[PDB]
Swiss-Prot record, chains A, B:
Portion held of the full protein: 15 to 103 of 146
Record flagged with keyword Transport: yes
Protein localization: Mitochondrion outer membrane
Role description: Cytochrome b5 is a membrane-bound hemoprotein functioning as an electron carrier for several membrane-bound oxygenases.
Keywords for the protein's UniProt record, in alphabetical order: Acetylation, Electron transport, Heme, Iron, Membrane, Metal-binding, Mitochondrion, Mitochondrion outer membrane, Phosphoprotein, Transmembrane, Transmembrane helix, Transport
Subunit structure comment from the entry: Component of a complex composed of cytochrome b5, NADH-cytochrome b5 reductase (CYB5R3) and MTARC2.
Native species: Rattus norvegicus (Rat)
Any one Gene Ontology BP term: nitric oxide biosynthetic process
GO CC, alphabetical: intracellular membrane-bounded organelle; mitochondrial outer membrane; nitric-oxide synthase complex
Name of the molecule in the record: Cytochrome b5 type B
Domain of life: Eukaryota
Residues bearing PTM Phosphoserine: S66
Length: 89, 89
């Protein structure tokens, strides 16, 4: 069941956005446009460039971001990963 | 100049890695060294051999790879396609 209020992106569409002109990334089943965040990230640009257009959930959690960082991610949230591209829990 | 965190490859060079000794492939503007991946590819070696050395984004996405297949590709990423060789738009 897709949610009328949410815009969904297939991982194929996220994979296209892997350039400095447009960088998207998936974190926990949600899509973030970090294009403008790249030069402001306190963890630097490179870690984000390397996984541009991809699901970087594991790296994000391995680093262990703070509640403050998670709060900050909300400003870049743009949609949910299409139901079909979500993995079983 | 470009981005020093990125090694760039011209499609002319990528095209030469089309045998089992060294097979590279392009997916969404990035180069992947699949030489060790061939044996382990669930869809078999032949489908990779067929587009070895070329951009196989279309066939990759048309097949419908899973989130796990995408995660798996990351370890083979060696660099980006030279900007001159990408689509103009
Ligand atoms: C919109 C998503 C993201 C936001 C808002 C964000 C935000 C931040 C912030 C605020 C910090 C400072 C320390 C703290 O608050 O925990 C930080 C550090 C860091 N971030 Fe992120 N980050 C994001 C995504 C990522 C991703 C996807 C990666 C990995 C590919 C990453 C890798 C790092 C690293 C390596 C550090 C350094 C911390 C350490 O020394 O271990 N971040 N990030
Ligand atoms: C780094 C590049 C690639 C990786 C890591 C990869 C990985 C995988 C994995 C893990 C599967 C199992 C099903 C799934 O998880 O989706 C799979 C299946 C398959 N792959 Fe690939 N693949 C790659 C490139 C390609 C390319 C370029 C082609 C086409 C020329 C291809 C054709 C197939 C086919 C036909 C299947 C079977 C589909 C099924 O019924 O699930 N793959 N691949
Ligand atoms: Mg060499
Ligand atoms: Mg994953």
């Amino acid at each position: 069941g897709s949610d009328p209020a949410v815009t969904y992106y297939r991982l194929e569409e996220v994979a296209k956005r892997n350039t400095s002109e447009e960088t998207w990334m998936v974190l926990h089943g949600r899509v973030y446009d970090l294009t403008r965040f790249l030069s402001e990230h306190p963890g630097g640009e490179e870690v984000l460039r390397e996984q541009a257009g991809a699901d970087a959930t594991e790296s994000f959690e391995d680093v262990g971001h703070s509640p403050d960082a998670r709060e900050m991610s909300k400003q870049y949230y743009i949609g949910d990963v299409h139901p079909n591209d979500l993995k079983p829990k």
